[PDB]
Amino acid sequence: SGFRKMAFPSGKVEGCMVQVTCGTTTLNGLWLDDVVYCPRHVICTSEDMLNPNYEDLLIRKSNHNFLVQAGNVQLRVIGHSMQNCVLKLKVDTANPKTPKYKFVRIQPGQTFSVLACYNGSPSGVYQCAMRPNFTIKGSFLNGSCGSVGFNIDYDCVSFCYMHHMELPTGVHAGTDLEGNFYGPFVDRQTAQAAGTDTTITVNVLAWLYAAVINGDRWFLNRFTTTLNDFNLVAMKYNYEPLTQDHVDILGPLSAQTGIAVLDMCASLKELLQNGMNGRTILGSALLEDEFTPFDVVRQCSGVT
């Protein structure tokens, strides 16, 4: 028993982290097979970042200008290309520690682990969610760009995120591993609005199921609701509208606990309308939305 914000074991990703230097800028690279992936802003000086012309800036760089260092040893760059907002540096050596991997574009509301890195070195790992507004509330300082987000299915690492930017509001923005930004963001030092974020309803309900499984049951009530009634309340409290697809994914948790999904929504409704009244659920005094139904089933069953 017990329920923690658990990250995936970061070992397979640690073996891929490299340092990439271009001119005076240093950031993190992801070495998979004979390719190093990093944010294209590695080629910019702080002055360039105001309104960078990436095609022009890259034209002044050669393979020899990209210094790639894996731990202590140097990698030889034999090719460079820009794909959207990432640079792909072809190296002459395939990474011996390349795990089985996939590049996937996650949906908003999905979760992943971030291995925060500086100068090619990992400092820590944490589990976070991709916000409905495509930002992530991470922990990133100057030098963390190129750090990646991932999920792990047995031996396969699905890379889903690469860190690029910190918005003026302190929230984080980045791309998938093909250099496509999540959200409307651009890799430019300009004010950029993150749209209205919402709470991930299905994840809060999944976390309420994890609480029941672990013993926190005080929020369970004698009430039920409908998808229409619940969604009226969800809209009032800036929660994502719950759909039958969300109810279907909650199926296994509903089956294990014997608590119908609409009954759990009625508990969530009363918590949204009344608050916690000074109590906690799984050691939290607010409604947690960073555990998907899949994360809860995994942690509650022991999937390794």
Ligand X SMILES: Cc1ccncc1NC(=O)[C@H]1CCC12CCC2
User: Which of the stretches 88-96, 139-147, 188-196, 239-247 binds a second copy when contact is defined by CB under 8 A?
Assistant: 139-147
Cα–Cα distance, 271 to 269 (Å, whole number):
5
User: Which of the stretches 5-13, 64-72, 136-144, 279-287 binds ligand X when contact is defined by CB under 6 A?
Assistant: 136-144
CA of 194: how far to CAs of 53, 114, 117, 171, in Å? Answer: 23, 20, 24, 9
CA of 67: how far to CAs of 64, 70, 73, in Å? Answer: 7, 10, 11
Q: Identify which of residues 53 and 228 has a Cβ nearer to ligand X in the complex.
A: 53
Q: Which one from 41, 80, 164, 172 is the annotated catalytic residue?
A: 41
Question: Among 40, 39, 44, which Cα is nearest to 23's?
Answer: 44
- For residue 151, the minimal CB distance to ligand X (Å) is 22
Interface with a second copy, residue 280, by CB under 8 A: yes
User: Which of the stretches 81-89, 188-196, 221-229, 284-292 binds a second copy when contact is defined by CB under 8 A?
Assistant: 284-292
- Binding a second copy (rule: CB under 8 A), the pick from 98, 134, 166, 181 is 166
Tell me, yes or no, if 145 is annotated catalytic: yes
**Between 12 and 51, how does the x/- string for binding to ligand X read (CB under 6 A)?**
-----------------------------x-------x--
Interface with a second copy, residue 8, by CB under 8 A: yes
- Binding ligand X (rule: CB under 6 A), the pick from 110, 123, 127, 189 is 189
Query: Rule CB under 8 A: which of 78-117 touch a second copy?
Result: 115-117
Neighbours of 167 (CB within 10 A): 15
Q: In a 10 Å sphere around its CB, with 0-12 CB exposed, 13-18 middle and 19+ buried, how is residue 252 labelled?
A: middle
**Between 150 and 169, how does the x/- string for binding to ligand X read (CB under 6 A)?**
--------------xxx---
Q: Which two tokens stand for residue 220?
A: 């369970």
- Binding a second copy (rule: CB under 8 A), the pick from 69, 110, 123, 192 is 123
The residue assigned the tokens 């910019």 is 44
Cα–Cα distance, 102 to 177 (Å, whole number):
9
Which value, to the nearest 10 degrees, does the dihedral of the CA atoms of residues 195, 198, 200, 202 take? -120
* Contact status, residue 126 vs residue 116, Cβ threshold 8 Å: yes
Q: Which two tokens stand for residue 205?
A: 């309900």
Cα–Cα distance, 166 to 144 (Å, whole number):
10
Measured on CA atoms in the order 172, 59, 62, 99, is the torsion positive or negative?
Answer: positive
Residues that bind a second copy in the complex, under the rule CB under 8 A:
1-11, 14-15, 115-119, 121-126, 128, 137-141, 143-144, 166, 170-172, 214-215, 275-276, 278, 280, 283-286, 298-304
Q: Which positions are catalytic?
A: 41, 145
Binding site for ligand X (CB under 6 A): 41, 49, 140-142, 144-145, 164-166, 187, 189
